[PDB]
RNA sequence: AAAAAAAAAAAA
């Protein structure tokens, strides 16, 4: 419950800028399985 | 006992509030005038005929 | 390696290098250090090695300030550490 | 020991002189407005601010004709020419522009400053500008050709003010390194130095029908009378930086202090008849309360400063006013007044 | 019948594309340069199709895109003489 | 049995299509000038028509429409409560 | 989080080495140009 | 044209090179150079007119030292507060840091109006750019929290 | 036919950003053979 | 985004999902916000990363 | 004029103390990290 | 001597012409009496002297209040607050 | 004025007390980090000196 | 009704 910091970062497009995060890759991996997993089973549950 | 959002909130008082009754207070952000508009106008000659100034 | 556990001469060359550069460049303090990266420099000095925090027992009016606060703000914890006065590890613990 | 006169007329009774009284205040600059200069048929006045824009006002309303860009850094002097359809800019990026006000272009460049620009003055029968900076050098330059005619010398600090006038001393330098110079215009020689002030001078001004001025630093404004500059009087009780300095026709010095106070005083017995403090436009810091700038009106019935909150403050005399509202507290003390 | 056209924000966006691909780090390799132009190209035309072929200032937004794309590369080698570059040496498929 | 016909939210851009019947679109025109009065019609300006289309296809703004437009726009931002969003005019588009 | 690791008795070698670098580390002030130029002071007090 | 420019370039190699002693333009290189110098000289100067006659005027450079530390909190969002600092001194210092912030400021927006108009081809104007509006939206950010 | 080209003299006027305007109605005009340019150029008041 | 409250994020997933990857979220979102020597922590709105 | 009469009590009201700064050691100096946190404000905040 | 290399340029100065004001002085009174005239013509001027479809929606009137800016318009001294900067960084950061 | 020179130098060359600095300008820089900031950073002192709270 | 040097390749 209590995580790494957070590196934040702007994009550029010319016309806009917008934040780019950057999180620890071994959280990176545990919130790409939950991502996929929540999807997944959103899907299965009409939750959409 | 009102919510004041972040985006409306007031930091600071008006400048009616600051400066009082008796004092006008203006905000002037845009011009009157072009900026090809002269401040002093030249003085303008508009001929718009030959004509001799002495009888020839 | 880059990381593991962090041992007392790698803090102690952490402290060394805090106090000839500053907390504004972790990449020299990084440097002196072998098997750590800045960003845990950085981590390893924010959550323990700072002596700005509180690193005896709790008080018992530090536990009734950290319930309410879990209970008003639940599993905020970066929230909840600096009203309660100590790390958000800490007060999770 | 040197006399004094014991005739007690050395001191003159002040006259009376209504308080002054906030009118305006107008937005719109984005940086310290360090210029102003009213034309000379009162219908508009000019200010310069560290937005490094001129915007030309009109002096009734308040209300912004035009705005003018072309410096790049603070615009620190302006000047409307009576005989020209000129006016004249100065600024801390070292440009001297004079401004066609036929076309509202810069048609002219006075360059020679090594650094940034403080003051600028016209002189009031020839056709020269005057110029003053941080190179500790007091600039000449002739209109027409753009020739700089005159390097004035001596200095030791920025020159921070100047005025000119139609007799000798015609010019008058006060600078950073606390020293007044007073120069002949025709050889470029210093006619005299004044070492009173303990603080860099900052402030000039010139009576417009006595043949005197007056300079102003920190805590001090001397009053002196041409062309020997002996020292006339003390302005004393106005302990603030002191950056600007306003006679009226009718006998009235301005003083505006740094720190946001001012300071009203009579002219021929050197007696405050009014010490106010000015406020600050909302959102700004106590720190950004100071007067910056200050004129009158060719009227003289109106004071227009420029403030370091972005702010210009127009100022009437109090109309509602008689001598016995505001009763003069002033008696002829009998102190020795160590000099 | 919907009449479709590519809106003006999407243009501009398309505009900013290749000024981020001509303010790139490798934009001063012809090839890099060149192959940057195509992913842009073939990402907007496949994506717009025919919106994009009904809209004039898209037209001639692509055609001052790929007109900067070639000047930069003429500026590569320090010439901008239109005789010295024919269509020959763009256009050519990079087998050639 | 409901003017919103159809509906989409694209992440955080949604598009409604609503249809009236003549009552219903006096009533809520007639609802909103009595919330927001304004008797000299300052709506006009302010009011978004796509300046992209030809001449013809722009075809007319009228008071009904305009009012139509802003009574619908007024009538979907009082569902939403601003503490957690809301809809502002700058980045809305009505046409009817 | 974890407060440390205790040392040892014989210390392995890459504390040492990195103890011997941070101790070369801490005690540096000067840059190129001021380490040039007081070698060349003294070469040129040398050669006179 | 071209006989000023060989009047020049005899003038150049039979009486020499006047290199030193002319003022420079302020070009847009210089710009922000320029901008440090007039605010060093202005800040200095206030603190010589509020100085008391009779105090130790050597260690007044100490002061612009604080104004950079002061302008460096700004740029952080860090609260600026040195205790035992004179309040008058403070309060040159608070002064001219808003100066400085809104010159800054200006030329963001100024900047950012540029790039998104096409009007910049400059890689290293507009990455500036990206990192002043990253500070101000960081602030922004911050003070919304 | 034959002339020159330059740049525009008044880059001001442009039909895109003005709106729908009374005086210049579309179906207001009776139009006919069309004015070729060179009749605005052979009387420029009447035509411009 | 950014108007999102965490606690009433927190209770609406834990209302369509299990609680442990309710607080999961939840946690996840609240997070120090670092760029260079500037840095907060987020409290208040959604990390769209 | 004749010089103003100083008190110690504005000999000590007009002292600056030294800069702590925490971004630049110009001369690499070893400061105490007492003295690095000194001017930072984040320690002057009311957690409320 | 002098060391310049300025081509001549606007070399006659312009004066003010009859119509164009300047060189026409008059007894400051007079300035008063004009001042004064026209501030009092321009603070006369300003002051004028010579089934229903909504009902299962959860929220409701959640946008009254929002109509009433612009009642006058307020200056603020704090660039990173004013109403000009918080467009521009709602406008460029999305 | 050279005695009082030598007197103070002897003085400044005694190591009585805890060392951070690394240079003798850092020494003397230190000694007035210390003159003005005591008053001001005893408790930060205190706290760096227990190992505990603030 | 038809638009073509420098940065930048370093003080016996």
Known sequence: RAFKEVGIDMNDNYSTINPVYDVEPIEKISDAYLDQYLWYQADQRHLF | ?56 | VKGGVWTNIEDEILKAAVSKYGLNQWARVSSLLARKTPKQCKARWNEWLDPSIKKIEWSREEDEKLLHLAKLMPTQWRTIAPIVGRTANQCLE | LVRRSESLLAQPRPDWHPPWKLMRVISGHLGWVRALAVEPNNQWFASGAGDRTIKIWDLASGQLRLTLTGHISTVRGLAVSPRHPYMFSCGEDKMVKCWDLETNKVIRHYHGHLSGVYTLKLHPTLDVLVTGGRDGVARVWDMRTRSNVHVLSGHTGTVADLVCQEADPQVITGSLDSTVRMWDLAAGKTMGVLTHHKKGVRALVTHPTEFTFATASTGSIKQWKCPEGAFMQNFEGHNAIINTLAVNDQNVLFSGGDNGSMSFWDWKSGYRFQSLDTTAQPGSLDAELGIMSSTFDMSGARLITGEADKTIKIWKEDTTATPETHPIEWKPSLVRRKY | ?96 | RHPIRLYTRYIDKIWVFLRFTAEESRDLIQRFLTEQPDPNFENVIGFKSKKCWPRDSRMRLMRHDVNLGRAVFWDLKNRLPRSVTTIEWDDTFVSV | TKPARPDTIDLDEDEKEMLSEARARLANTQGKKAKRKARERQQEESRR | ?145 | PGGPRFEPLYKDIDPNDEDFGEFNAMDRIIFRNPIRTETRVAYPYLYN | ?49 | ?48 | ?94 | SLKRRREKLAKSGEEHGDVTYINEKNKQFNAKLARFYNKYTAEIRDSFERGTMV
């Open chain 12, 1 to 94: 001597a002098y060391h310049q290399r300025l081509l001549p340029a606007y070399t006659t100065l312009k004066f003010r012409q009859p119509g164009q004001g300047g060189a026409a002085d008059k007894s400051t009174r007079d300035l008063r009496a004009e001042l004064e005239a026209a501030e009092a013509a321009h603070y006369a001027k300003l002051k004028g002297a010579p089934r229903r479809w909504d009902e299962d929606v959860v929220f409701k009137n959640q946008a009254r209040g929002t109509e009433d800016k612009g009642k006058r318009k307020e200056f603020v001294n704090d660039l990173l607050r004013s109403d000009f900067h918080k467009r521009f960084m709602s406008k460029y950061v999305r």
């Open chain 2, 1 to 56: 006992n009102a919510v004041i959002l972040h985006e409306d909130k007031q930091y600071y008082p008006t400048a009616a509030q600051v400066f009082g009754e008796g004092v006008e207070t203006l905000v002037q952000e845009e011009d009157a005038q072009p900026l090809t508009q002269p401040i002093i106008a030249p003085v303008e000659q508009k001929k718009f005929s030959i004509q001799e100034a002495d009888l020839p």
């Open chain 5, 1 to 96: 019948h919907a009449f479709l056209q590519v809106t003006e924000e999407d243009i501009q966006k398309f505009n900013n594309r290749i000024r981020q691909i001509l303010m790139s780090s490798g934009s001063t390799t012809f090839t890099k340069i060149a192959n940057k132009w195509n992913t842009a190209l073939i990402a907007l035309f496949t994506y717009y199709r025919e919106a994009a072929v009904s809209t004039v200032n898209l037209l001639d937004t692509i055609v001052k895109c790929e007109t900067k794309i070639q000047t930069r590369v003429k500026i590569g080698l320090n010439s901008k003489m239109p005789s010295r570059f024919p269509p020959a040496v763009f256009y050519t498929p990079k087998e050639l």
């Open chain 8, 1 to 145: 044209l071209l006989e000023r420019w060989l009047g020049n370039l005899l003038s150049r190699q039979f009486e020499g090179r006047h290199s030193k002693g002319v003022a420079k333009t302020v070009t847009k290189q210089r710009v922000e150079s320029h901008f440090d110098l007039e605010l060093r000289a202005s800040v200095m100067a206030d603190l010589m007119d509020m100085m008391p006659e009779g105090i130790k005027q050597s260690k007044v450079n100490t002061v612009l030292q604080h104004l950079s530390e002061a302008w460096r909190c700004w740029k952080s969002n860090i609260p600026w507060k040195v205790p035992g600092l004179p309040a008058p001194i403070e309060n040159i210092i608070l002064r001219y840091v808003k100066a400085k912030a809104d010159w800054w400021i200006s030329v963001a927006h100024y900047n950012r109006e540029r790039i998104r108009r096409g009007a910049t081809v400059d890689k290293t104007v507009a990455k500036k750019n990206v990192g002043r509006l990253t500070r101000l939206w960081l602030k922004a950010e911050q003070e919304r929290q």
């Open chain 10, 1 to 49: 985004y950014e108007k999102i409250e965490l606690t009433l994020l927190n209770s609406l997933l834990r209302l369509i999902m299990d609680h442990n990857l309710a607080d999961y979220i939840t946690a996840k979102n609240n997070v120090t916000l670092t760029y260079k020597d500037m840095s907060h922590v987020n409290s208040y709105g959604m990390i769209r990363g």
């Open chain 11, 1 to 48: 004029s004749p010089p103003r009469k100083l008190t110690a009590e504005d000999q000590e009201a007009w002292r600056i103390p030294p800069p702590v700064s925490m971004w630049k050691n110009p001369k690499g100096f070893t400061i105490p990290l007492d003295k690095r946190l000194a001017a930072d404000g984040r320690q002057l905040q009311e957690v409320q």
